[PDB]
Scaffold this active site. Structure first.
Site, PDB file in Angstrom:
ATOM      1  CD  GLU A  83      -2.766  -7.444  -3.589  1.00  0.00           C
ATOM      2  OE1 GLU A  83      -3.638  -7.548  -3.426  1.00  0.00           O
ATOM      3  OE2 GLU A  83      -1.235  -8.027  -3.422  1.00  0.00           O
ATOM      4  CD  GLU A 127      -2.204  -6.945   3.974  1.00  0.00           C
ATOM      5  OE1 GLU A 127       0.113  -6.275   4.056  1.00  0.00           O
ATOM      6  OE2 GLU A 127      -1.998  -7.663   3.676  1.00  0.00           O
TER       7      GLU A 127
HETATM    8  C1  5MB Z   1       3.995 -10.486  -5.986  1.00  0.00           C
HETATM    9  C2  5MB Z   1       3.956  -9.697  -4.259  1.00  0.00           C
HETATM   10  C3  5MB Z   1       4.523 -10.538  -3.440  1.00  0.00           C
HETATM   11  C4  5MB Z   1       3.964 -10.205  -2.056  1.00  0.00           C
HETATM   12  C5  5MB Z   1       2.586  -9.932  -1.992  1.00  0.00           C
HETATM   13  N1  5MB Z   1       1.614  -9.666  -1.178  1.00  0.00           N
HETATM   14  C6  5MB Z   1       1.106  -9.021  -1.192  1.00  0.00           C
HETATM   15  N2  5MB Z   1       1.049  -8.716  -2.544  1.00  0.00           N
HETATM   16  C7  5MB Z   1       1.393  -9.385  -2.629  1.00  0.00           C
HETATM   17  C8  5MB Z   1       2.690  -9.498  -4.668  1.00  0.00           C
END
Ligand code: 5MB
Ligand code: 5MB
Lengths: 346, 346
Positions: free
Chosen positions: B314, B171
């Site tokens: 992610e 996510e």
């Molecule tokens: C820069 C940044 C900040 C929060 C996040 N959460 C997932 N990827 C990220 C990237």
């Protein structure tokens, strides 16, 4: 040997400072990638790596040897399994072979003391046909131990010359969990019962005897804990010795080594006792299902990445962890930068 | 939807029995490869896998969306970071992108509710421009939740048609650890304080407020724990919903899904509450550094393979675990057999 030990380089703090900074600027909240970051900073400090986290070629060295202690009934696997498996290592059908191939690493089978005829295809560094039964005496002589350390060490750093940048260490020797336990007990000051495991499926009934063997080995030999070579020669083994050798070799070459399981932790303790300078080059892989694992890792002050409940040996856990190392590198090199995206975090 | 749920296939016990037997005959002491064996037996039971542990193509679905709760001051990352990163996902510069590439998996960025203009290159399944602020009401409607479940589910199983055999879920949504915590608290019956974490580096001072938000969300909405969709719609999010969707989709397709971190555990609980039949398809990746992780995994009854102290999200942990899955397969398929070596173990 003392020369060798003398020359182990300290890590490069300058490289480490530059790595850290870089990692801090990547597209993520600082520290979010946790152990992946730390890992990368650790590699960066390894002289043989050229100031950056990177992985060239990869190799898993497998040290094979038999043990006199097998006759104490501490192992259910038939003695010849060492020789058989060693040959299998040549055909790529073993677990370590399968996993190394998956990781794109090359397996090196080294015969340091198998009680059998020589195996074609196997690197010969045979000390003898099995080591002495630690239960009633030393496994070998001090000179024997030192010489092997030297020889394996060299072999190791020499591979570095052919583009190897990451080593994985492993072993093969029926009944080897016994000497491993004795070493742990000795360096750690832990009672035998506390660190003696089931090894290759030893039946629960047979344990008591295994513990007595270990204690005996110790009482009889009186290994000096402050003297790693002493310990190795007395209640160790050709294979334990070889593992330590890899460790000293890679460290001298300024490169990283991935540990495997309990046997490897054993060799690690010995290496660290011999040359603390070795420490920073060492990289845990998994958390062995062997009983004495937590004790051993605690003394090493290490926290494995992988929890697979593995207990096969051969350097299988080592191979399994290689991708993780590559991960850290990829992270370092291929991620985008915050600044570049106009992203500002507090 | 009920149809969908109806049709989730149970695992194939016959396949599992054959796998087990096979694994038992490989060149190693039985059970020595531990979790690697179990993993393989688990895959073998997945209908979409064709009676054997195998991995064709791989994909990581990333569900992106914004949250109304961001205005409660629960997040230090600027709102637009969702939209920015989402675009980055398209250029392959993100952490998940870097890790997926390393694993040879393909990343799919899905926009389920980003509060920004549409991003070219991003799959559009946008429910709205951010979800409602759970602090003062529901995140969305039940119908809204169901429809997305349906749509993501389908998208998921459809990839199966193009040769995907392994999914990784992830996510992207600033402030998402808040709704995640509320869900955990609700399904688990754990007090808020017990499961509320620092998220993307929230300062220690700001915590107290985060906990109050969660409690509020709950008091106000009164989500029914026995009703996963209810929970999702009320104190969840578009992205949480999408994740659950993947889970239901892969399960229906009879395929495995690798979880990621705490947010994913959240979605997992919801999926399991909705359809327990989902469980057996789920595969933990790593152990998230988020505070509510142990509680969440306990309820899921899962034990991650990797301990990296990661907390980026992610789907980065998911990607990182893929090689492990491939390992188990390689093991199953490429190892030699005991019998073939004339090796007999008790
Ligand atoms: C820069 C940044 C900040 C929060 C996040 N959460 C997932 N990827 C990220 C990237
Ligand atoms: C078959 C067999 C038995 C013991 C082993 N230890 C390492 N590999 C092994 C293989």
């Amino acid at each position: 040997l003392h020369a060798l030990l003398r020359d182990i380089p300290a890590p490069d703090a300058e490289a480490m400072a530059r790595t850290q900074q870089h990692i801090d600027g990547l597209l993520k909240p600082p520290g979010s990638l946790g152990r992946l970051e730390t890992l990368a900073v650790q590699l960066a400090g390894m002289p043989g790596l050229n100031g950056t986290p990177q992985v060239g070629e990869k190799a898993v060295l497998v040290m094979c040897a038999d043990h006199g202690v097998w006759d104490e009934g501490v192992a259910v696997s038939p003695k010849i399994v060492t020789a058989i498996q060693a040959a299998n290592m040549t055909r790529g059908t073993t677990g370590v072979c399968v996993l190394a191939a998956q990781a794109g690493a090359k397996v090196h089978v080294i015969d340091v003391g198998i009680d059998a005829e020589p195996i074609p295809g196997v690197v010969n560094m045979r000390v003898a046909r099995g080591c002495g039964n630690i239960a009633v005496g030393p496994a070998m002589s001090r000179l024997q131990a030192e010489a092997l350390l030297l020889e394996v060490s060299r072999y190791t750093c020499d591979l570095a010359q052919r583009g190897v940048t990451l080593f994985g260490v492993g072993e093969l020797g029926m009944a080897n969990t016994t000497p491993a336990a004795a070493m742990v007990s000795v360096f750690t000051g832990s009672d035998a019962k506390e660190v003696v495991g089931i090894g290759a499926n030893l039946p629960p009934s047979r344990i008591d005897n295994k513990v007595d063997v270990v204690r005996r080995a110790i009482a009889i030999n009186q290994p000096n804990p402050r003297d790693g070579i002493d310990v190795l020669s007395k209640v160790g083994g050709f294979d334990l010795v070889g593992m330590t050798g890899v460790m000293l070799g890679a460290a001298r070459c300024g490169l990283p080594v991935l540990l495997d399981g309990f046997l490897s932790y054993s060799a690690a303790l010995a290496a660290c006792q011999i040359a603390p300078a070795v420490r920073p080059y060492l990289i845990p892989s998994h958390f062995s299902a062997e009983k004495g694992a937590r004790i051993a890792l605690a003394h090493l002050s290490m926290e494995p990445y992988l929890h697979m409940a593995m207990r096969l040996g051969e350097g299988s856990g080592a191979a399994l962890a290689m991708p993780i190392v590559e991960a850290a590198c990829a992270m370092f090199h291929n991620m985008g930068e915050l600044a570049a995206s106009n992203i500002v975090l507090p």
